[PDB]
Design a protein around this nucleic acid. Structure first.
Length: 615
RNA sequence: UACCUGGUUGAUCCUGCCAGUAGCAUAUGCUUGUCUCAAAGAUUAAGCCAUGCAUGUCUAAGUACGCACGGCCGGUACAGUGAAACUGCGAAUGGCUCAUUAAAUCAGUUAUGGUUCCUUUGGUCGCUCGCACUUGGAUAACUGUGGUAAUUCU
RNA sequence: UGGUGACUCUAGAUAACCUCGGGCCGAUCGCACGCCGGCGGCGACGACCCAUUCGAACGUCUGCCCUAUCAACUUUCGAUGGUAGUCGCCGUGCCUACCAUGGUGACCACGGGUGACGGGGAAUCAGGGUUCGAUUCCGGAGAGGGAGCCUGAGAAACGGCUACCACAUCCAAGGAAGGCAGCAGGCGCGCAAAUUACCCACUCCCGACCCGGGGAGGUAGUGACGAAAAAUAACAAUACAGGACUCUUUCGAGGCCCUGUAAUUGGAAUGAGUCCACUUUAAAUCCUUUAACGAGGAUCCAUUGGAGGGCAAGUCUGGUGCCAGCAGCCGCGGUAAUUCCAGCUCCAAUAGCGUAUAUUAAAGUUGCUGCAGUUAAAAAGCUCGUAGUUGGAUCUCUCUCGGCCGAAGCGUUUACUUUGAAAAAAUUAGAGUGUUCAAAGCAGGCCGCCUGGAUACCGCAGCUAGGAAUAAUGGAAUAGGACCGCGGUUCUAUUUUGUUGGUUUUCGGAACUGAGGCCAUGAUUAAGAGGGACGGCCGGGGGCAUUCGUAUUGCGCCGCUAGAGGUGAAAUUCUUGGACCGGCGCAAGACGGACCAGAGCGAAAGCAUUUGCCAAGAAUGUUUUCAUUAAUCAAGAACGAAAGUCGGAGGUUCGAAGACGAUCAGAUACCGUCGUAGUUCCGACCAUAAACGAUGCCGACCGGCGAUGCGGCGGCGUUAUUCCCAUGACCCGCCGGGCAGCUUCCGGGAAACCAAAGUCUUUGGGUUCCGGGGGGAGUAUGGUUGCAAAGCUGAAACUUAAAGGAAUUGACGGAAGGGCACCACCAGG
RNA sequence: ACUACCGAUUGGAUGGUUUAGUGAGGCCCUCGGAUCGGCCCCGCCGGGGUGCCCUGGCGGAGCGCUGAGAAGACGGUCGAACUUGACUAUCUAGAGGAAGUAAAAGUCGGGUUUCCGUAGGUGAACCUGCGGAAGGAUCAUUAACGG
């Protein structure tokens, strides 16, 4: 490039460009045009009382909103030219923390001085890492509640206790109002993490919610979700999803006056009939017994880890009947399988994409590179919803918040979701393949019966009958369609409504063509050995059983590969050819493959979790 | 401690590089009980900066009429301490960074017989043949009236 | 007057000047107060100037990294110099005016780049060196970019001002205000870096100042950057296991034997911790010192990498099965996995240890010490030639002024060596001294004293004084050369012509000159260096003209002609007009065989018919001449096979291209028939080759042999029909310079091989070019030459663990021979 | 569907040498005189020496004279910067062209020793034309020549 001025001027140009990008990013929050900065406060340890820090932090002009249980307020300061919205959460109550930490702009964690944090807070923090961190900001409370002598070593011990979970952060303390000024200054200017799962749709937080019942006996009426738009330009025709209560149609948007402007009734849109998105999720045209079962599950998992899929052939039931729908494959990787060969009535009830990647690109470019005529971000708007149950307002009076987000096109239909997911080491309870588990798949909450498979690059995926503690699996189930990326969480009712976390991951591409193959290997003990010829017993029990499964190729735990020549006895006595000679301590085994499909167990309603505790 | 080892071939002897070996410096991973030293926004961006601080100053010895004070003794010009303000000096030292800059900077060497110099130190300070037992006019400090949304504005 | 090495210095005299935007010659304060109405001691501030100190500012000599795909730069608008000025604190093209046309450069100017602030210095390192230095000390530069100022002794100052640019804060929209490359903090950038703490107590600085201020600085906080010390256990008895010793044939048994291992037993001793008190300190913290509690290993529990080779420590067990993976490299995985993943065991370092990148030593793989160039990567195609580098032998202290000495010249000038004085501290090497040891530190030690706080290095360049080998350079050869006296011309003597005005005092010194004497008067020698002469020759050395041969081709004539041409076979083609053929000729261009050699000449490319001319050329011979004139060469220049390219001529043969015919599962290579440019000559381009001895040029030493060419020398004998004298041709030697061969344990070398490819770790005669694993690639780009084709110079991105060189065997011959056997054959049974 | 070249849009933007022009602000010079003060002149007056010499105060005009002096301006100078073309140098959106890659078992299917330099065959390999090399495997003979 030469000519030192030329290199310098090119560098100055690039500097200008990246500074313009950064400045264009940072005005989107906490300002005259920006929406308020939502800060969610979690006291991790049980010794901390959030009211103490909450009143140290509340002083600036305050506006104390109130709810049934939680207490969140609005803060406005022209000194820092900053609008804050502080909302408090309790650890263990994973409902509230999970469904309102996915819209909060910055999370402030409180830590006791003596210990790191509570085990319940440890569970909460594990779940929050697994679903996505907006911005964490470490804080402590009891540092100045001790003399200096133990104070410095207390900070040292906390710094020791944090580096195992948070890799490196400074611990910013809260004891005085001036320290709260330092913290507020810190939270005003942070390297904001763009959690793209928030940004790609039009998500809105509700400050007011009013129910106008059309008919009180029908227990359904018009809802007034008024608050701030925080994602994209929100459009009426796109449907609206409430995080705990499903996706449904919204009828009207108005824009009233904002409650808290930084420097101190008209309707925006009604939904046209033809341009509306239609609510069509499917195609229109068509005590000690539990302990004993748990021990049986333990024995089954122990049997299905040292032996992969060894199934003993029953001598009562005929073998070609019990494995009627199975087929044999020469090689798992290379042998073709038709994805449209055998389909039930369930895949005649979902929606398929001709090309997912093209559709995802088109939808994302239509969101980003195009502008719609809806209300812009930062606006204090009100949404009138035609169809909603009453009880959500009751929940709005309980203490849980309401968050409503406008969906992408084709996000309400049913499809076959595939979730890349690995087991959390905190839980060790054996989970079978077709169990009913709760998915938190990115603002959605539902029980499902998934199917676990390997996460390889090939076409066929062998079904996993149990969840492995290190291998990363793919959970496949009928589910409402969601566009990746998406944080995915797996929970189970342990006892008394305690949601236990098992596994977490991301959402992979959604398609029904990803077939899952269930395998069964049948064992046989070779009791006669010639050179490259063997006579094997106890694999079948009839005579026509060997004749039915003639073309299937036998393999061997010691690596030999063969194919059967003839049946000899009336019982299961079987002549087999081989590449080489078997050892005397050897077993032959034959692979049988079938296509397996997930169960249709989907329901959007979820029970409210109780506060989590350790056994 | 003036050192070498594996790798071309059927095998050998070579040229020859690749790789290993030791250092030293930055980053980073994993782990970390004592104790004494101790580097630390140089590299990328000599990019941008919210807020606080970083440069002030009085002796017996320039100017005291702020009762601001305890306080003389009373017509005692000025008893004392002394805010403020004028005056004098400093603020050009220090700190910071390495962008510029290739006989430039810089280093040793010489020169000012080609110059400037606060301060400090020693000299010089009735050499001059031409109201002074004390000269003049202001201006702050203070009193009082104000302007401007606003300033260490006036 | 006084002084420097040198003044246009300092001092003195005279004539004057001395700015109204002006120069000094106390209209000042404090402290005690006191003596014959007047005189006074001490201190503070001040002041024109001088000197000083702290500096600043310009100059001087020497010393920077990479680049030629940067070779000419500078000068209209100062570039180099001269004179006068302007401005400046001064010296100057610093600026102006007038002149002159200069100044720098292959000793690399000018232009670029730099991931450049320079140095002290850091890391490594035998010796040499290589790399780094933003960074606490010194010097410099800048406060977002440029610019211009105020005030002041000192600023082109930014914690001062004024503008424009770029950002950017408060508005009441009229305006106002900026500058963290200061300390903390944020954003941003990133692989990458700490507290919006406390204090002026230490160190020092500032002020009016025994008092005030100090994000300078100190002190704590974060801190596995790096560095020093150093715990995680010690002893005894048992209980086993081994090893030796003794007694026992052995098995076995003992020891006042050894060595291990024990969630075995016993006691004692401790620190990490929790905590008091003191000390520390500005107040603290820490370290140090005390009470109190505080330890049985089944924890107050050590990690990080590894166990195929390099490279220490397992062919241990289970799982996965050329999958997953491991592995820097070589490689492993395809089922007994020595390499993956676990367990156990073990190794390495150890409060540390992995990885990535940069750089260093290894790398004698950047070579000055100290590499290589026949075949592995490499010597230019060849010669000339400038700068550069290098270069034969030779030669052994004094005359005046002052007290035997000091002053003055030295001696042609340097390089070299040695000494001396100057060369910042820290860092480094290093002396001393129990920081408890140590890294450190500069302290400390003894009954108020006694001491330390050294030293060495500090390259080059510049001063200094000796040395005179070695290496340069000079002193007399048209003799206007030295040393002495004998004279002239001119300018001058600073005192002796008491005081003088003087034409003259004398004396002596300087520049040009005429003879004389004097010097042992003055020229080292002739390289087994070179040049140049001269003699006889010698050669396919070159050019011009001339001449000859033979073949081929064409034409004319005669004769016989029906086939001829070609091939492994064939076929295309010519011919009955008349081929091929045999002969007589003519013409056209070509080429100079056999002679022809391990010969010859030429710088190489290359050069072969006779004769003449032209100018060369080596070697030999010389008791010739010049006397160092030489070797190799960046730049630059002639020649340069074939092919090619421009203009002409001529075209016999042959022939790129192009046209036929054969040959087939697939032939398009293959073979034979024609045929254009070309091959030839003349004049210009082109400048490349396997341009090859795959071996730069010059010089020295180092084995043998017996042939050849040229020249010379010495010769028994043989031939010119015995030769009448010399003279050519054979034979035996010797010398010099060549062309080559044989052989050697000269020595080299990886070897093949080589009398050089030797005299090379026992490494240095001079010099030129050039190579750095293999590809990309002699490619792209740029410059330059060329009509063009092309040539010369010439990368990188990316890519691989080999590519390569010499020699030794033979699995195998689809290579050939033998030889064997009534389990093979002949004759047969 | 994913890369990465070329490129229609002078695509736009910014900087360094610049040609020409314009030129903020400071400084210097020439001016200028908002004002402030003084020297006079009157009118009211008090004193001394004998209405006259000078005094203290007030107010007035006399463009009477004098000292200081602000704004502003011509001119010089340094000079940031602004506009216009050229040389550039760089950053940043793009219709399209030519490519390639993963996905379709979809349709049709004998010769040569090895080179080097040039020129032609069609760019290269290969072949041929001309000139060169070995880095490519030497068996047999060779005294007389006089009459």
């Amino acid at each position: 490039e030469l000519s030192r001025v030329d290199q310098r001027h090119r560098a100055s140009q690039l500097r200008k460009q990246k500074k313009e990008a950064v400045l264009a990013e940072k005005r989107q929050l906490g300002g005259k045009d920006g929406p308020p900065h939502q800060v969610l406060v979690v006291p991790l340890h049980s010794r901390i009382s959030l009211p103490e820090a909450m009143q140290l932090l509340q002083d600036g002009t305050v506006h104390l909103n109130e709810l049934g249980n939680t207490q969140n307020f609005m803060l406005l300061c022209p000194r820092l030219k900053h609008r804050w919205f502080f909302t408090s959460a309790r650890p263990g109550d994973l409902h509230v923390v999970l469904d309102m930490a996915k819209v909060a702009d910055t999370i402030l964690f409180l830590l006791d001085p003596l210990e790191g944090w509570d085990s319940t807070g440890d569970y909460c923090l594990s779940c929050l890492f697994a679903q996505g961190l907006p911005t964490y900001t470490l804080a402590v409370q009891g540092i100045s509640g001790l003399p200096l002598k133990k104070q410095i070593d207390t900070r040292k011990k906390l710094s020791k206790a944090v580096e195992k979970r948070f890799p490196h952060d400074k611990l910013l303390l809260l004891d005085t109002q001036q320290e709260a000024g330092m913290l507020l200054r810190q939270l005003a200017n942070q390297k904001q993490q763009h959690l793209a799962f928030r940004d790609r749709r039009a998500y809105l937080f509700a400050h007011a919610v009013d129910f106008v019942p059309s008919e009180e006996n029908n227990l359904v009426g018009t809802l007034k979700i008024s608050g701030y738009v925080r994602g994209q330009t929100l459009n009426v025709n796109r449907l609206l999803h409430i995080v705990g209560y499903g996706d449904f149609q919204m009828k009207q948007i108005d824009a009233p006056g904002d409650p808290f402007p930084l420097n101190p009734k008209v309707l925006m849109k009604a939904d046209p009939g033809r341009q509306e998105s239609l609510q069509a999720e499917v195609i229109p045209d068509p005590d000690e017994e539990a302990e004993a079962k748990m021990l049986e599950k333990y024995k089954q998992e122990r049997l299905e880890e040292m032996f992969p899929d060894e199934v003993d052939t029953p001598r009562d039931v005929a073998a070609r009947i019990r494995f009627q729908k199975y087929r044999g494959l020469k090689s798992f990787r290379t042998s073709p399988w038709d994805p449209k060969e055998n389909l039930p009535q369930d895949y005649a009830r979902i929606f398929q994409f001709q090309n997912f990647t093209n559709t995802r690109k088109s939808i994302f470019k239509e969101v980003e590179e195009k502008e719609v005529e809806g209300a812009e971000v930062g606006w204090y708007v009100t949404l009138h919803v035609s169809e909603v149950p009453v009880s959500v307002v009751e929940c709005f009076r309980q203490g849980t918040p309401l968050i409503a987000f406008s969906l992408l096109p084709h996000e309400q239909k049913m499809s076959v979701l595939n979730m890349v997911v690995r087991r959390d080491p905190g839980n060790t309870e054996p989970v079978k393949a077709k169990e009913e588990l709760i998915f938190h798949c990115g603002f959605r909450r539902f029980r499902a019966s998934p199917l676990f498979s390997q996460h390889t690059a090939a076409d066929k995926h062998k079904l996993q009958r149990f969840l492995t503690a290190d291998m990363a699996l793919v959970a496949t189930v009928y589910a409402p369609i969601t566009f990746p990326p998406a944080s995915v969480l797996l929970f189970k009712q342990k006892s008394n409504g305690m949601h236990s976390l098992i596994a977490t991951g991301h959402l992979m591409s959604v398609d029904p063509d990803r077939m899952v193959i269930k395998r069964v290997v049948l064992s046989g003990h070779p009791f006669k050995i010639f050179t490259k010829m063997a006579v094997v017993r106890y694999m079948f029990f009839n005579r026509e059983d060997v004749l039915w499964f003639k073309p299937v190729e036998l393999r061997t735990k010691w690596g030999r590969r063969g194919h059967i020549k003839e049946p000899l006895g009336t019982h299961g006595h079987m002549k087999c050819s081989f590449d080489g000679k078997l050892k005397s301590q050897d077993t032959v085994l034959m692979n049988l493959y079938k296509r397996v499909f997930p169960k249709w167990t989907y329901d959007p309603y979820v029970p409210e979790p109780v506060p989590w505790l350790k056994s």
